[PDB]
């Protein structure tokens, strides 16, 4: 579950 | 838990480039997570400057895109941060965080200042009362620090034993080199017995002073 | 790419009392919005993140709310404790941006401070160098006037001036009036005064020594 800003 | 340090030389000339290392525990870089490197001004303003996945992949901040090099080392667990032809305008301190729900992980940042300056450790005097005032049950005793160019300084009581009442005081500069003083408050029992001691600490000048704090006589 | 506008650059409360803090996108980036604390001389701390969700160990007094483009961050009550700067950030897109910043100041009731005189250290006289150093202790508000005298003397040249960064406990500040010599100077006058003025103190609060006084 990571932020889309990570890729 | 996650743990991160970041670890670099806190002096660089300009047209030079840095590469700063950040070590994490507890944690595989390569198991999950965005490693990042952020960095805040002066005025505190904070900057994201790029980072790795765990997989290889690099995405960097489109103004620093020309500058900047982040690679990692699997088998140390750690990954750098290279920038190059630094101007003074670099100075900052650079951090290195886990992406991921934003960055919960932050290390404890390392500072970096791009001059050409002269590194020069720090004078240190005792600022010690002027025998009249004599305010019985509480005494104040000091600490100054001045003359000294990075900046860092870091400045303790009895190695961090005494921690209350510390009043500690920003950096300025005086023409061109740093100037600080620290004030601790005591028990008038305490102080002519016992001694306080003031650790100063000067990072890439690489000075561990100690100043001992006597009476007027 | 994306600016996060935080609208009031500082602010300061009372104990007890609410505080609604704002961050702007200039587009859309859905809840991804993380609010984050820093005290004096410490690292980020990720307070909020997802927008509305209180991160690990993170106090009830903190709530977060808003999306797509515009955020509030809400401490129920104000704590001495919450002194710091609060930051807001966008990991929507491409490249993460932060807000400008909004620092947190306490408010407290009106505080005299004490004052120490500190004469130079021999030991500092060895190098040609005398410096007279005036401790204004816990006190507050900030805004307070040091004035330097010798023999009486207005002194203006060669005095820097600093404050610390006001207590966590207490909320009061600090600071220091460093007024520095040479030796032959420092041993051409006799008396020394520092005198400041406050809010608090009708009349000039003063501090002197003798130099003749060992």
């Known amino acids: 579950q990571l932020d889309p800003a990570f890729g | 838990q996650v743990t991160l340090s970041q670890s670099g030389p806190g002096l660089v000339k300009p047209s030079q480039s840095l590469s700063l290392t ?33 997989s290889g992949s690099t995405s960097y901040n489109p103004s620093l895109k020309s500058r900047i090099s982040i690679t990692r080392d699997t088998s140390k667990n750690q990954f750098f941060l290279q920038l190059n032809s630094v101007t003074t ?35 240190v005097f005792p600022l010690v009362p002027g025998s009249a005032t004599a305010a019985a049950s509480a005494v104040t005793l000091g600490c100054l620090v001045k003359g000294y160019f990075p900046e860092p300084v870091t400045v303790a009581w009895n190695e961090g034993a005494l921690s ?35 650790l100063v600490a000067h990072p890439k000048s690489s000075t561990a002073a100690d100043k001992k704090i006597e009476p007027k006589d | 790419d994306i600016v996060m506008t935080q ?3 500082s602010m300061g409360m009372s104990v007890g009392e609410a505080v609604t803090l704002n961050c702007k996108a200039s587009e859309n980036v859905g809840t991804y919005v993380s609010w984050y604390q820093q ?92 410096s007279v150093v005036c401790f204004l202790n816990s006190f507050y508000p900030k805004s307070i006037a040091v004035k330097w005298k010798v ?19 207490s909320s009061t500040y600090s600071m220091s009036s460093t007024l520095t010599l040479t030796k032959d100077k420092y041993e051409r006058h006799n008396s020394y005064t520092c005198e400041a003025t406050h809010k608090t103190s009708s009349s000039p609060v003063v501090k002197s020594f003798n130099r003749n006084e060992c």
């Open chain 3, 39 to 130: 005290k004096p001389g410490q690292s980020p701390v990720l307070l909020i993140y997802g927008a509305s969700n209180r991160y690990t160990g993170v106090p009830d007094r903190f709530t977060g709310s808003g999306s797509a483009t515009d955020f509030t961050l809400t401490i129920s009550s104000v704590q001495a404790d919450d002194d710091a700067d609060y930051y807001c950030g966008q990991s929507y897109s491409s490249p993460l941006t932060f807000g400008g910043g909004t620092k947190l100041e306490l408010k407290r009731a009106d505080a005299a401070p004490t004052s120490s005189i500190f004469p130079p250290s021999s030991e500092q006289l060895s190098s040609g160098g005398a």
């Open chain 2, 22 to 54: 950040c070590t994490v525990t507890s944690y595989s870089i390569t198991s999950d997570y965005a490693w990042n490197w952020i960095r805040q001004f002066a005025g505190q303003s904070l900057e994201w400057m790029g980072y790795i996945s765990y």
């Open chain 3, 151 to 169: 023999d009486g003397s207005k002194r203006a040249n060669g005095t820097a001036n600093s404050w610390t960064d006001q207590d966590s406990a």
């Open chain 2, 164 to 198: 209350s009442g510390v009043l500690t005081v920003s950096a300025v500069l005086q023409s061109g080199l740093y100037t600080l003083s620290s004030n601790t408050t005591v028990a008038s029992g305490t102080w002519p017995s016992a001694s306080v001691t003031c």
């Open chain 2, 89 to 123: 305008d670099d100075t900052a301190t650079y951090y290195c965080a886990r992406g991921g729900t934003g960055f919960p992980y932050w290390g404890t940042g390392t500072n970096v200042t791009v001059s050409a300056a002269s590194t020069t450790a720090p004078s």
């Open chain 3, 7 to 9: 609208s009031p650059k």
